[PDB]
């Protein structure tokens, strides 16, 4: 089809230590965004006299 959309990453997770057997565990996001690719013509035309092709 005439155009395509690609998803891609935009933010990364991270991770953390814990104090002993019991301490607060933490939190992180993961984020995405878009890229596009468009499509275009390339074309050429050539003429020849009919008899030459025979």
């Amino acid at each position: 089809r005439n155009q395509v959309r690609f998803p891609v990453l935009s933010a990364l997770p991270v991770a953390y230590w814990v104090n002993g057997d019991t301490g607060l565990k933490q939190t992180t996001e993961i984020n995405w965004t878009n890229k596009y690719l468009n499509i275009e013509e390339i074309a050429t035309i050539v003429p020849v006299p009919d008899n030459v092709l025979a």
């Binding site: 891609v8 953390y16 939190t27 992180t28 996001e29 993961i30 984020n31 995405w32 965004t33």
Partner: protein, 43 residues
């Protein structure tokens, strides 16, 4: 860091569209004159 809630917009790019067409299209009346008038062939 205890508030890093992933939003809808953070993930939105991953969600595909969808489209459906059951309401596309329309009815047609047949032409009145060809319904009513007497047909005759012609060459």
């Amino acid at each position: 860091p205890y508030n890093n809630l992933t939003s809808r917009t953070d993930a939105q790019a991953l969600i595909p569209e969808e489209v459906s067409k059951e309401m596309l299209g329309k009815a047609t009346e047949q032409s009145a004159v060809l319904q009513q008038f007497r047909r005759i062939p012609v060459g």
